[PDB]
Amino acid sequence: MEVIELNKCTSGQSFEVILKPPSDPSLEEIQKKLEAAEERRKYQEAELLKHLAE
Amino acid sequence: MREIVHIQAGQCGNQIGAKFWEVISDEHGIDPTGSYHGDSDLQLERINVYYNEATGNKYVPRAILVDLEPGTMDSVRSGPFGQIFRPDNFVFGQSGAGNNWAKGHYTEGAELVDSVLDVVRKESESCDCLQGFQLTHSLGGGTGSGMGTLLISKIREEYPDRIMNTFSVMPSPKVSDTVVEPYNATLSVHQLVENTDETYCIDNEALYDICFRTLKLTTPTYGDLNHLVSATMSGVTTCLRFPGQLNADLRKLAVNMVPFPRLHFFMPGFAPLTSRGSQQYRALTVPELTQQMFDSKNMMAACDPRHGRYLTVAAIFRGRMSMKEVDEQMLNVQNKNSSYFVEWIPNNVKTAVCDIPPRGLKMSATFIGNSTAIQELFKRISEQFTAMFRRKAFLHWYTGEGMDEMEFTEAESNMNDLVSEYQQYQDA
Amino acid sequence: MRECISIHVGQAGVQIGNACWELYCLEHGIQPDGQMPSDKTIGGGDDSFNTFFSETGAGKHVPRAVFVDLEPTVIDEVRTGTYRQLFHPEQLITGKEDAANNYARGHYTIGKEIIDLVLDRIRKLADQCTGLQGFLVFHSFGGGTGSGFTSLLMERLSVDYGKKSKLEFSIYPAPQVSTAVVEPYNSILTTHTTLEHSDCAFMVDNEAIYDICRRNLDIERPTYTNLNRLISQIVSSITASLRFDGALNVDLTEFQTNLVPYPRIHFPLATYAPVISAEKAYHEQLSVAEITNACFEPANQMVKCDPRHGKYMACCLLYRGDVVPKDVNAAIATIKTKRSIQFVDWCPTGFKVGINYQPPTVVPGGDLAKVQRAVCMLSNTTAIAEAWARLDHKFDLMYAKRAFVHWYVGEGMEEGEFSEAREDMAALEKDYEEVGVDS
Amino acid sequence: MYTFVVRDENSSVYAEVSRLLLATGQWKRLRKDNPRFNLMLGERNRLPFGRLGHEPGLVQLVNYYRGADKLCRKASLVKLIKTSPELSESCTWFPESQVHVIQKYLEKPLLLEPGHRKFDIRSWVLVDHLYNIYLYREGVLRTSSEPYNSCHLTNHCIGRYEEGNEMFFEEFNQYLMDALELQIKHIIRSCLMCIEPAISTKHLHYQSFQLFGFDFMVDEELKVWLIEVNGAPACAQKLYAELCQGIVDVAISSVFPLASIFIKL
Numbered sequence A: 001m002e003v004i005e006l007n008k009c010t011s012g013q014s015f016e017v018i019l020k021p022p023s024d025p026s027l028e029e030i031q032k033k034l035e036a037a038e039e040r041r042k043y044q045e046a047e048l049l050k051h052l053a054e
Numbered sequence B: 001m002r003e004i005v006h007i008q009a010g011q012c013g014n015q016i017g018a019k020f021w022e023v024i025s026d027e028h029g030i031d032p033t034g035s036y037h038g039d040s041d042l043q044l045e046r047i048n049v050y051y052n053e054a055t056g057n058k059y060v061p062r063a064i065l066v067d068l069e070p071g072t073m074d075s076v077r078s079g080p081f082g083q084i085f086r087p088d089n090f091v092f093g094q095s096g097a098g099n100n101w102a103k104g105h106y107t108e109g110a111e112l113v114d115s116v117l118d119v120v121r122k123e124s125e126s127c128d129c130l131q132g133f134q135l136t137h138s139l140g141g142g143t144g145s146g147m148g149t150l151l152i153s154k155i156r157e158e159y160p161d162r163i164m165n166t167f168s169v170m171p172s173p174k175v176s177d178t179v180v181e182p183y184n185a186t187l188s189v190h191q192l193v194e195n196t197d198e199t200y201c202i203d204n205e206a207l208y209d210i211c212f213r214t215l216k217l218t219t220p221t222y223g224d225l226n227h228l229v230s231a232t233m234s235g236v237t238t239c240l241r242f243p244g245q246l247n248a249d250l251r252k253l254a255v256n257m258v259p260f261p262r263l264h265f266f267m268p269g270f271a272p273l274t275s276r277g278s279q280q281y282r283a284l285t286v287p288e289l290t291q292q293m294f295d296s297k298n299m300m301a302a303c304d305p306r307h308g309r310y311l312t313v314a315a316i317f318r319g320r321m322s323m324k325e326v327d328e329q330m331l332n333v334q335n336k337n338s339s340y341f342v343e344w345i346p347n348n349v350k351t352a353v354c355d356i357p358p359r360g361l362k363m364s365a366t367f368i369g370n371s372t373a374i375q376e377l378f379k380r381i382s383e384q385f386t387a388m389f390r391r392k393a394f395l396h397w398y399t400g401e402g403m404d405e406m407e408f409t410e411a412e413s414n415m416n417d418l419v420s421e422y423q424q425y426q427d428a
Numbered sequence C: 001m002r003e004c005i006s007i008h009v010g011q012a013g014v015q016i017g018n019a020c021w022e023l024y025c026l027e028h029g030i031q032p033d034g035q036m037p038s039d040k041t042i043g044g045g046d047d048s049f050n051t052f053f054s055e056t057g058a059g060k061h062v063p064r065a066v067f068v069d070l071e072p073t074v075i076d077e078v079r080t081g082t083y084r085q086l087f088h089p090e091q092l093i094t095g096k097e098d099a100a101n102n103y104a105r106g107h108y109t110i111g112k113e114i115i116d117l118v119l120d121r122i123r124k125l126a127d128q129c130t131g132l133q134g135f136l137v138f139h140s141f142g143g144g145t146g147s148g149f150t151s152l153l154m155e156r157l158s159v160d161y162g163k164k165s166k167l168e169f170s171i172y173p174a175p176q177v178s179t180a181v182v183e184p185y186n187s188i189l190t191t192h193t194t195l196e197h198s199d200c201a202f203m204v205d206n207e208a209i210y211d212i213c214r215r216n217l218d219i220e221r222p223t224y225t226n227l228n229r230l231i232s233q234i235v236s237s238i239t240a241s242l243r244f245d246g247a248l249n250v251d252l253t254e255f256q257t258n259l260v261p262y263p264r265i266h267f268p269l270a271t272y273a274p275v276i277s278a279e280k281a282y283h284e285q286l287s288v289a290e291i292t293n294a295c296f297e298p299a300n301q302m303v304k305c306d307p308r309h310g311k312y313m314a315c316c317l318l319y320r321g322d323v324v325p326k327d328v329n330a331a332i333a334t335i336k337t338k339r340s341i342q343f344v345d346w347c348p349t350g351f352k353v354g355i356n357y358q359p360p361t362v363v364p365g366g367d368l369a370k371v372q373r374a375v376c377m378l379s380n381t382t383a384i385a386e387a388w389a390r391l392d393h394k395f396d397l398m399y400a401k402r403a404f405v406h407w408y409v410g411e412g413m414e415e416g417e418f419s420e421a422r423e424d425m426a427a428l429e430k431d432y433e434e435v436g437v438d439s
Numbered sequence D: 001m002y003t004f005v006v007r008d009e010n011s012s013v014y015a016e017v018s019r020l021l022l023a024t025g026q027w028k029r030l031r032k033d034n035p036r037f038n039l040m041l042g043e044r045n046r047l048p049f050g051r052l053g054h055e056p057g058l059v060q061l062v063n064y065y066r067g068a069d070k071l072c073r074k075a076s077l078v079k080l081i082k083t084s085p086e087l088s089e090s091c092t093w094f095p096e097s098q099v100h101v102i103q104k105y106l107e108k109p110l111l112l113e114p115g116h117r118k119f120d121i122r123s124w125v126l127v128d129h130l131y132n133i134y135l136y137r138e139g140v141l142r143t144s145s146e147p148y149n150s151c152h153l154t155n156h157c158i159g160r161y162e163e164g165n166e167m168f169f170e171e172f173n174q175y176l177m178d179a180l181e182l183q184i185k186h187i188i189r190s191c192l193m194c195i196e197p198a199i200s201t202k203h204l205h206y207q208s209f210q211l212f213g214f215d216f217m218v219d220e221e222l223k224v225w226l227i228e229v230n231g232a233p234a235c236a237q238k239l240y241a242e243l244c245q246g247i248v249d250v251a252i253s254s255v256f257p258l259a260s261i262f263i264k265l
């Protein structure tokens, strides 16, 4: 039961008790994915409106 | 996601529509002159979902009244809450539709539809954030069925990213006006499968049996039938009109209820079932509300839920009651009858509780089921359709309006596909 | 002094945020108008509470916080409520329509339209900082915004603030209070996309909190208000070391170094005690040994799981109130002979302990009794993977039939993302198994 | 009405257990993937312990103790017997000890005559949710039909008096009485109570019970040597009806009431 690194201040204290020792996408990439999803929405709506026009 | 635009078309559509507004005006404390007189702010919290604010604290239904003849709308204008509707929102022709889908969809209805869209557009444009649309109509006549679905198609074209919701009355021979009702219904379902996000299947067959057997009415009238409809409509829109967590807007409801786009046809139910001028003295318990709302004899689609499985269910409890009890009873039903709820959609039953009970009741519950058994309704319509179509009977009424036989064949095959698609998940 | 910005996303994130800040104000002696009598420095300072609060010339103490939601109704309650004066309007950000419980809708469709505004509002707070440590992000897994917009925001934060640490407080979905059938989808989708952007994530299962409110607070049917007050106690005890003078977990980075050896395995289990009903007229005041033993009871954990059948990588005990190191060590020593505590072989078997003399503050008229001592244990154990197994299974059931998938594809998300996300979770579950299981 | 699921079709023991429950009339068997159950008769490998006890409105139970594989895996058994403080001490009853375990061979055993044949002892041990230890009053002596060839093994893959090469306890007593009621009870509770803190579902959200098959080998001096524990044992015929009914009696019904032949260690 070794206690290491005891630190005390007026607000409280902290320490460590050891029982036993051991044995990203860029901005442009993000805009690209967002725009690809937007375009698929656009395409899907376009196909719907095409159907309705028929 | 606040404003809803309400549309009511044809005779059945306008008559149930009028009752809907009558009932929810009372619940929100709106008088027949459009002024508020309630004792709770819960009434006004979300009133903008169905009502516009005018001048002098006047509330006006965001409602559009459509018909191809003036009769039913003259009657509405004379009704108890007739003067609450905006005068300019009455749109009507003179010729009628003769119980003919083609006249509502292709000829007579086409002449009137732009003017309806003008009124729809005006309502939509002054919406802070339009949720979508709610349409009341029957499938068995000509205006509500043919022009109703024409409108839906036109609306989807201008407002493609909005939710389309319908209360659709299904015809039945037990309460029939004309023999062509299966033709009109089959043509309509075709439209509904493609162009609505959610349809409440209100079956005149089930409404009749409930009035006759359960409510012991020897001679049910359309009035008795509409009493059941307006109570159900109040119940299923409760989560949209009052503060709450679950299914609080049209799109969240669809996301919770519709796992596959075409399968969006709901079996509604209500408890306690009551006749007009009913005594209604003993309030029901939570276990009583719960057992009754789940009971097949209580469903308003004339299908047996016991023959199928629920994809999804929404339950709404109204009145002051114990939420602990409600949670217990809802878990009880599912745990004791787990086979009736598809295991591949975990926790597919969602419960809401609103403090404010409907008029005349201390406690009620509204059921909304997406059951594979709903195929029985479409199979029934398909049978009646086919008995006539095999002999080309009464087709001349439709070909005379420019329609071809092949459009009937196509409509019939699409409804058969729907039945097949429900059947494939009934055993999966 | 180094600053921390808090970010609350969606209803869950926002409502928990409000509970936390109310509590922070009570703990630091700050009134709803922002005035703080205790603070001798006016219009400035570099005290420990200045990591969460900035100051104006009028002596107003303003939270370094941003609230974001895609519909206005939840944040409207902040704008009009008790602590309306606390925040300035530009912190409180709302859109018009929500993500409808749809990750794709909050991430792709609506997220694209509001992300730049949110980031610029965040830059506004950041430019007020002399040394920004990073961000604390509060959100649900199940909501369209909490899941969809948060993962987008995290991605852009890694870009705009590459050095800064990011911590999550995440609400894991529970059917007893859930509002959507597709919550398992949103959970897996958001976890996949956020994984590489989050340094340490504190996961809270609503089921656990719900049952703790039922069994320990005698609340029949817990509301969000009940849940959030409990949650904000646990959050407070976790963030206290950044807000008060001390030497343990004093910066965001230290959370990772102390709790997270393997970057992907960054989900510490929180366990709290005691939770005592304010309604009891006779409180049996718990000792240090007692509240410390409670930390090893599944019943007190933020996620129900069994740490006996997993391995510990790290353990931190955070005490508030009348507690001395001697009694902690005596307690740890007893517990070691009565509990199944197995650490991974490449880590020391031990505890980092922090004590703050101020006993937990409670909200007046709340459900929580004031106690003389409390403890929150943070332990990176592989057992929390049980929560991923449960989630992954529900996902598997629906996805096999493609139930509800069309709602996501219709928002412009590709079906492949579903399987890319499930694979990441499959690997994540495999990583825990390698670390925690031996054969 | 109680509900349960079967996730291991091949269990001969729990096929009867399932057979017994349905016959009660107050048990409905569910699809394997239905989570709304009271009882789980689980798969042998990678049982989803993490998914139990998270169903509101349902007390759940499983027919396996998570972590008992430390006892029931030979390689695991050796480490546990060697490393654990209370089990390693006193351990005079364990022979000195893919992946393999080579362990000290008993030079000469007890030998029944006629035959000069070898045999082993399998006892059945049921542990319930309260962590009571329930030995089965009937044990099975699996025999080799061939004379000891200093045959070496009695596994059915490997019958003049012994029918199916099974001597049924009572006869053994008489042989002990002709040719020549402790060490077995001490061994069972030594192993299981050792692992108690690690596997007990005392205050868990779900509960466990498990059937174990303890295999024994006895020697010249009538000292009993334990060879391994079986996590998924099968019963001997004629003992199935009795044993399985007891499992229902004490491990299932005891938690799920309707409307002895175990010695409690």
Ligand SMILES: CC[C@H](/C=C(/C)[C@@H]1C[C@@H](OC)C[C@H](O)C(C)(C)[C@@]2(O)O[C@@H](C[C@@H](OC)[C@H](O)C(=O)O1)C[C@@H](OC)[C@H]2O)CO
Pocket: B290, B291, B292, B294, B295, B296, B297, B305, B306, B333, B337, B340
């Ligand atoms: C659970 C979904 C559901 C399926 C079933 C089978 C459910 C189960 C239970 O309700 C939840 C039955 C229920 O517990 C009762 C026994 C009280 C009761 O209501 O059962 C019905 C008959 C029953 O079908 C036999 C019913 O029609 C029904 O639908 O039952 C008579 C009724 O007279 C007052 C009463 O005796 C379909 O939505």
Ligand SMILES: Nc1nc2c(ncn2[C@@H]2O[C@H](COP(=O)(O)OP(=O)(O)OP(=O)(O)O)[C@@H](O)[C@H]2O)c(=O)[nH]1
Pocket: C009, C010, C011, C012, C013, C015, C016, C069, C070, C098, C099, C100, C101, C102, C106, C139, C140, C141, C142, C143, C144, C145, C146, C147, C171, C172, C173, C174, C177, C178, C179, C183, C206, C224, C225, C227, C228, C231
């Ligand atoms: N603990 C807790 N959970 C909440 C709270 N509010 C919502 N939740 C949970 O959060 C999950 C998702 O809901 P929300 O956060 O409300 O959804 P959202 O982020 O606003 O996303 P959208 O409304 O779809 O745009 C559900 O599982 C709820 O149970 C809350 O105040 N406290």
Ligand SMILES: Nc1ncnc2c1ncn2[C@@H]1O[C@H](COP(=O)(O)OP(=O)(O)CP(=O)(O)O)[C@@H](O)[C@H]1O
Pocket: D095, D103, D104, D105, D106, D107, D119, D120, D152, D153, D154, D155, D215, D217, D227, D228, D229, D230
């Ligand atoms: N130390 C020893 N002394 C004498 N015989 C031994 C022995 N170790 C093994 N044997 C003989 O070999 C047999 C091997 O059976 P073992 O228990 O190793 O595998 P098994 O076939 O029973 C698989 P299971 O785990 O399902 O029981 C022993 O029961 C015994 O007959």
Ligand SMILES: Nc1nc2c(ncn2[C@@H]2O[C@H](COP(=O)(O)OP(=O)(O)O)[C@@H](O)[C@H]2O)c(=O)[nH]1
Pocket: B009, B010, B011, B012, B013, B015, B016, B097, B098, B099, B100, B138, B139, B140, B141, B142, B143, B144, B145, B169, B170, B171, B172, B175, B176, B177, B181, B204, B207, B222, B223, B225, B226, B229
């Ligand atoms: N429930 C109900 N059904 C009606 C009502 N009026 C008509 N129906 C049904 O509606 C169908 C006839 O359509 P209808 O609305 O009268 O024709 P339309 O004016 O051309 O739309 C038939 O199935 C009738 O049974 C009503 O007031 N209530």
Ligand SMILES: [Ca+2]
Pocket: C039, C040, C041, C042, C044, C045, C046, C047, C055
């Ligand atoms: Ca200061």
Ligand SMILES: [Mg+2]
Pocket: B011, B012, B141, B177
């Ligand atoms: Mg008519």
Ligand SMILES: [Mg+2]
Pocket: C010, C011, C071, C098, C143, C145
């Ligand atoms: Mg929201």
